[PDB]
Design a protein around this motif. Structure first.
Motif, PDB file in Angstrom:
ATOM      1  N   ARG A 213      -2.744  10.790   6.008  1.00  8.74           N
ATOM      2  CA  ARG A 213      -1.698  10.810   4.983  1.00  8.74           C
ATOM      3  C   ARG A 213      -2.274  11.131   3.607  1.00  8.74           C
ATOM      4  NH1 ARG A 213       3.107   9.251   7.182  1.00  8.74           N
ATOM      5  NH2 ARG A 213       3.022   7.704   8.866  1.00  8.74           N
TER       6      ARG A 213
ATOM      7  N   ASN B 214       0.824  -1.202   0.000  1.00  8.41           N
ATOM      8  CA  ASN B 214       0.000   0.000   0.000  1.00  8.41           C
ATOM      9  C   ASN B 214       0.862   1.259   0.000  1.00  8.41           C
ATOM     10  OD1 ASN B 214      -2.571  -0.987  -0.237  1.00  8.41           O
ATOM     11  ND2 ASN B 214      -3.245  -0.404   1.823  1.00  8.41           N
ATOM     12  N   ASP B 215       0.232   2.401   0.271  1.00  9.15           N
ATOM     13  CA  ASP B 215       0.908   3.691   0.315  1.00  9.15           C
ATOM     14  C   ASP B 215       0.797   4.339   1.693  1.00  9.15           C
ATOM     15  OD1 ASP B 215      -1.829   4.266   0.138  1.00  9.15           O
ATOM     16  OD2 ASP B 215      -1.542   5.982  -1.192  1.00  9.15           O
ATOM     17  N   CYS B 216       0.704   3.519   2.737  1.00 12.98           N
ATOM     18  CA  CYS B 216       0.439   4.008   4.079  1.00 12.98           C
ATOM     19  C   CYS B 216       1.273   3.245   5.096  1.00 12.98           C
ATOM     20  CB  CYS B 216      -1.045   3.877   4.421  1.00 12.98           C
ATOM     21  SG  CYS B 216      -1.495   4.472   6.052  1.00 12.98           S
ATOM     22  N   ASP B 217       1.627   3.937   6.176  1.00 12.96           N
ATOM     23  CA  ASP B 217       2.309   3.347   7.321  1.00 12.96           C
ATOM     24  C   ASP B 217       1.420   3.579   8.535  1.00 12.96           C
ATOM     25  OD1 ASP B 217       4.103   2.207   9.093  1.00 12.96           O
ATOM     26  OD2 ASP B 217       5.654   3.731   8.842  1.00 12.96           O
TER      27      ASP B 217
END
Ligand SMILES: *[C@@H]1O[C@H](CO)[C@@H](O[C@@H]2O[C@H](CO)[C@@H](O[C@@H]3O[C@H](CO[C@H]4O[C@H](CO)[C@@H](O)[C@H](O)[C@@H]4O)[C@@H](O)[C@H](O[C@H]4O[C@H](CO)[C@@H](O)[C@H](O)[C@@H]4O)[C@@H]3O)[C@H](O)[C@H]2NC(C)=O)[C@H](O)[C@H]1NC(C)=O
Ligand SMILES: *[C@@H]1O[C@H](CO)[C@@H](O[C@@H]2O[C@H](CO)[C@@H](O[C@@H]3O[C@H](CO[C@H]4O[C@H](CO)[C@@H](O)[C@H](O)[C@@H]4O)[C@@H](O)[C@H](O[C@H]4O[C@H](CO)[C@@H](O)[C@H](O)[C@@H]4O)[C@@H]3O)[C@H](O)[C@H]2NC(C)=O)[C@H](O)[C@H]1NC(C)=O
Ligand SMILES: *[C@@H]1O[C@H](CO)[C@@H](O[C@@H]2O[C@H](CO)[C@@H](O[C@@H]3O[C@H](CO[C@H]4O[C@H](CO)[C@@H](O)[C@H](O)[C@@H]4O)[C@@H](O)[C@H](O[C@H]4O[C@H](CO)[C@@H](O)[C@H](O)[C@@H]4O)[C@@H]3O)[C@H](O)[C@H]2NC(C)=O)[C@H](O)[C@H]1NC(C)=O
Ligand SMILES: *[C@@H]1O[C@H](CO)[C@@H](O[C@@H]2O[C@H](CO)[C@@H](O[C@@H]3O[C@H](CO)[C@@H](O)[C@H](O)[C@@H]3O)[C@H](O)[C@H]2NC(C)=O)[C@H](O)[C@H]1NC(C)=O
Ligand SMILES: *[C@@H]1O[C@H](CO)[C@@H](O[C@@H]2O[C@H](CO)[C@@H](O[C@@H]3O[C@H](CO)[C@@H](O)[C@H](O)[C@@H]3O)[C@H](O)[C@H]2NC(C)=O)[C@H](O)[C@H]1NC(C)=O
Ligand SMILES: *[C@@H]1O[C@H](CO)[C@@H](O[C@@H]2O[C@H](CO)[C@@H](O[C@@H]3O[C@H](CO)[C@@H](O)[C@H](O)[C@@H]3O)[C@H](O)[C@H]2NC(C)=O)[C@H](O)[C@H]1NC(C)=O
Lengths: 106, 136, 142, 142, 106, 136, 142, 106, 136
Positions: free
Chosen positions: A68, A18-21
């Motif tokens: 985010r 994904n594009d998230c932490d």
């Protein structure tokens, strides 16, 4: 600029306007107990290197991922807002958000 | 391979000079190149170094010794096959014989961050050097 | 909408490294370029994410002058960095100021800028504004 | 709700001489100190008292450099001063900027600061904010 | 920070949000300099040295001794609010007080 | 009691000098110190003075003559028992014999504000002086 | 009517040449004068009318220094001008800053000033503030 | 500072708070450029010179004359307000007009 | 009518001079006057010019050649019947014989905006000139 009213109803409500932490550790300015005996004076103050506290925002209802995403999509409005003005010093923004909230809710 | 140095001489304190380093039978577009100096009675110390790739942003990555930061600059021209050093605001502690060197051990991969090329066991093809003397 | 005090509006800076964007200095230097004819802009924010990789960059012309701008007294180093990369460079064919290709901001100590300054440690990131009161702030912060 | 316009908010700055605090230069010098690591901050007020005692102070190191900061273009001398004490001195063991030990501000011409400046006449005082309109302000003024 | 409203009807009322002097001589900008006719033009203005006028606020309902008390409890919030900001130029609070007034009349 | 001067000499216009004044059998932490000068054919004029109490903030109280403000800097070191004056940006009108003086009349009570110690009738224990000449 | 967003207000600068006022350099130099004792001021405006006549003026004393002021970083040349008059001069018996006798403003690129700067093309004009939403903006504009 | 409100209740209505030229042409900050997709980024922007579009305001109900006289009596009120402040850099008025509108609207 | 020049000489590079131009039997308040120069082997070139009416604001209208802008300053004093040129930061390309000239053709009506009086066919009453030499 977009702005959510991050408010309560444990179970909590996300409003707007994904594009998230998942792990989000941040720095901030003394979460509570703003006062002491002689701490508000800048002579007995924290200093420029030690005035930051560390916190960890928990991903309760996918807060961190959506913050985010909101941060990544805010730049479209923010750069176009910064293009119009001609001053090259630091530009405050919270007054514009408060006046926008007052204008829109009435 | 074969290098030569030029541009040294005698200047007063606070003066400026520009040294040139040229190669006769070697194309310098395959080497990372450096300037060194040596004083009488002292070891041969690092001065400056410059890398071999271009990176569009941060074009040629350079490195300097701490005594010569914000005073000396290194540069290269690939078509003229030349490496220059412009020295400004000279002190009498900078009086030394200056040498030009190249390496092929490094200058692979890309952008070299941090103290790189500060050694002397990998540099080869040293020139005869030129004398830079700063005195009153 | 529950907005009772003006200091309930927070401006947070989130780094690109938390968005699973590759942040090594090898492939982070291709988001940056030079351009003439654009004024630089700065914006104040309040707090920010603790950064993973930060950068300390000074580039110069072959005549010996820096191509980046002189930092004002407002600009300070970024507060928290786990890794700081020290890059010294030289760029002959390049005039103007430094700009970001993705439209992101160069984060400093409570200042987000569209340009990079000399001798200051920054990161790449974007800011977001929200409204948080104290009772919900104590619930999430820890 | 007596706020009708934004010009109804006044910012009178009250001096410490009317607070029954001593204002001789010896006793007033015991509320001032030097500290590094704190940026200076300025705030704008609109009007204020006529001071009893004012100070014109320059402090230098053994080398010759002034330990006090330089004043910006908006810093001017304090308007009304019955007595201006001219003080000059040398302070070897002291680094940083000048700060007040109570919380009081260094009042200048419509600018209150947390620090001292080179060659400017100031006083001590704290600014207060309230709201009056024109009928009340003709009722109270003179 | 604190900001009292201060209203008339002569008896008078105080509405918030010895060790004092009774006399309070202040300097102000001007009531109305428009009555001269051309004094609003800067070339026909008075300048720096003649810009202020003198006045005397009268301690009617112990007004001066409570303003001097109010100014001392104001300093803590002002020093904290200046601690939050990073700009070294002078910071205006009139818009901030007006927005804080508007965000509480609900 | 016994004082002595050192550090004078011949300099060009715009130069700098540093004068030291030392006491042999006297501790200068009991006295307020001062520097004077005298030109040939002129009277002996005040140059600088420094007081005897420390004050934490604003430290030792100093005073300068109007012709030498923002150029001359006085200093005292108590542990070395010395008083110094640094002259920066010298003009040829500063050519004089410079003298060192001590006083115990004032420098009691504390902070000395405004023109203080500007006369010569209370200073005693004058040294032999040193010659400072500024010429092209 | 009503006002919805903060950006819906505009401040236009209208030039005096549209007020049927003479704009030749002789007939416009009789509205400018030097005076001491007043600070210069600047105000932001959004857009405005391009002038028929613009001016580029430098004034020096017999010593050699200029009687006008250096431009800050925000001051730029006026955007569109039909003609620009280039005037140089020497003014011995005058000191201070330049001011407008009618009380009008020296218009630059989105900054209106009470004074006149060096090497920067200005015009004479006055600014007005108003409220326009996007619907009647598209109804009026072009 | 005076301020009209251009409503549309073509015919337009005016609500506040020879020497006139009928033809009014202006320059303005770009709006359609926001729909470009990539030009909001400052590297892909137009720059200083290409930032402006020319346009024309039509004179349908003595609009231009009532804007020119609006500026001519607005400059008298604005300059006294510039006299009060102590800052010599670029000063904005948009927030003050918005807060004044919210204060007189209540 | 008759004019004379004074103040020329030999200076180093970066130096400064001041030329004076006087008239004995001519009141200079009716003419606009200019300074020219001529090098050996070159034509006689324009340097500076100053006008004849006052304007309160923008007092006397001046004009300069492009090589001497921001370095040379012309001045007029009608009471002393003099025209001065203060030259600053001299280069060795400025070495020439300098001449003072008067004209009554223009300087009527009012302010002369833009390049005016830049030719030589209308200036008359040339003086004998003075030699200004800038060399190392
Ligand atoms: C929100 O966050 C997202 C995610 O990080 C950001 O989206 C990125 O935006 C940048 C904008 O530059 C994108 O970068 C571009 O990548 C492309 C490269 O080609 C690939 O195209 C597709 C992508 O899948 C593949 O099929 C193909 O094989 C290629 O691999 C190009 O479109 C761009 O190249 C540009 O630069 C080069 C040289 O500099 C030149 O050719 C041209 O100038 C060209 O325009 C560019 O490199 C990036 O891919 C996006 N990421 C994702 C994951 O989508 C947003 O920017 C961000 N929003 C903000 C910050 O506001
Ligand atoms: C708001 O108004 C009030 C008064 O109404 C002011 O309060 C004063 O605050 C200062 C803060 O510094 C107080 O000073 C402190 O007093 C103590 C010692 O002083 C004397 O105390 C009594 C007085 O009768 C006697 O025993 C004797 O004379 C003492 O000398 C200490 O608490 C403090 O000492 C600190 O500083 C010294 C350095 O000088 C060191 O020893 C230590 O650092 C020590 O911590 C200090 O001196 C003062 O007493 C208060 N006055 C009253 C009447 O209460 C506020 O300042 C004012 N706020 C503003 C202006 O912002
Ligand atoms: C809004 O727009 C209006 C015009 O629509 C402008 O009004 C002008 O204001 C100026 C202010 O200075 C007026 O100028 C004055 O001119 C007069 C000169 O008298 C001659 O002209 C009148 C006809 O105009 C005839 O009686 C006769 O020909 C006279 O010879 C005087 O009243 C003033 O002179 C003063 O200044 C000069 C030096 O500057 C000195 O002698 C004295 O100080 C003297 O007091 C003045 O010059 C002008 O006439 C007005 N125009 C019109 C058409 O009435 C506003 O300025 C404008 N507002 C803004 C903010 O821009
Ligand atoms: C990021 O990189 C910059 C550039 O290298 C660093 O700035 C440098 O900081 C050092 C340490 O403070 C400065 O050195 C000091 O110089 C003064 C005056 O000569 C003196 O006290 C000592 O010589 C001292 O070493 C140095 O001048 C400065 N360089 C520049 C070009 O500004 C910066 O510290 C780096 N950031 C980090 C490590 O966080
Ligand atoms: C507060 O103290 C400062 C201490 O510097 C005073 O500033 C000084 O003011 C004097 C008097 O105007 C200046 O002297 C004059 O200088 C000019 C130019 O050099 C010249 O006319 C004479 O030399 C004249 O003496 C002096 O330069 C100035 N000092 C500095 C450093 O700026 C200030 O006046 C005091 N304020 C009050 C209200 O008394
Ligand atoms: C309005 O007039 C001013 C002068 O009153 C003009 O400013 C002048 O602009 C030129 C062209 O940029 C400058 O010349 C340049 O000098 C640098 C350094 O020597 C070099 O790049 C070249 O020599 C170049 O020609 C000139 O210095 C400058 N003059 C002053 C006194 O600042 C300005 O351009 C005029 N504006 C317009 C729109 O015409």
């Amino acid at each position: 600029d977009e702005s959510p009213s991050f408010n309560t109803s444990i179970s909590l409500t996300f409003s707007y306007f994904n594009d998230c932490d998942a792990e989000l550790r941040i720095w901030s300015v003394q979460e509570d107990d703003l006062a002491a005996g002689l701490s508000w004076i800048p002579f007995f103050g924290p200093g420029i290197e030690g005035l930051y506290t560390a916190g960890l925002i928990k991903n309760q209802n996918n807060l961190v991922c959506r913050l985010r995403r909101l941060a990544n999509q805010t730049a479209k409005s923010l750069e176009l807002l910064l293009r119009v003005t001609t001053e090259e010093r630091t530009f405050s923004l919270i007054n514009r958000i408060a006046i926008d909230f007052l204008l829109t809710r009435w | 391979v074969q290098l030569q140095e030029s541009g040294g001489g005698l200047v007063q304190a606070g003066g400026s000079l520009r040294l040139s380093c040229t190669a006769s039978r070697g194309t310098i577009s395959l080497y990372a190149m450096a300037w060194f100096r040596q004083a009488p009675g002292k070891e041969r110390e690092f001065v400056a170094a410059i890398s071999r790739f271009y990176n569009d942003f941060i074009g040629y990555s350079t490195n300097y010794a701490d005594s010569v930061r914000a005073r000396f600059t290194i540069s290269r021209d690939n078509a003229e096959n030349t490496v220059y050093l412009l020295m400004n605001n000279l002190k009498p502690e900078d009086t030394a014989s200056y040498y030009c060197a190249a390496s092929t051990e490094w200058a692979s991969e890309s952008l070299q961050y941090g103290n790189w090329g500060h050694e002397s066991s990998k540099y080869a093809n040293w020139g005869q050097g030129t004398q830079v003397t700063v005195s009153s | 909408g529950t907005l009772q005090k003006t200091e309930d509006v927070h401006l947070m800076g989130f780094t690109l490294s938390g968005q699973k964007v590759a942040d090594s200095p090898l492939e982070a230097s291709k988001r940056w370029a030079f351009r003439t004819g654009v004024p630089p802009k700065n914006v104040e924010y309040t707090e920010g994410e603790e950064a993973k990789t930060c950068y300390n960059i000074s580039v110069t012309d072959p005549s010996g002058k820096s191509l980046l701008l002189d930092p004002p007294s407002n600009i300070r180093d970024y507060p928290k960095c786990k890794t700081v990369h020290h890059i010294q460079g030289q760029n002959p064919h390049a005039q103007g100021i430094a700009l970001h290709l993705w439209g992101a901001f160069f984060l400093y100590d409570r200042v987000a800028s569209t340009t990079m300054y000399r001798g200051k440690v920054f990161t790449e990131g974007n800011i977001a504004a929200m409204i948080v009161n104290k009772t919900v702030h104590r619930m999430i912060f820890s």
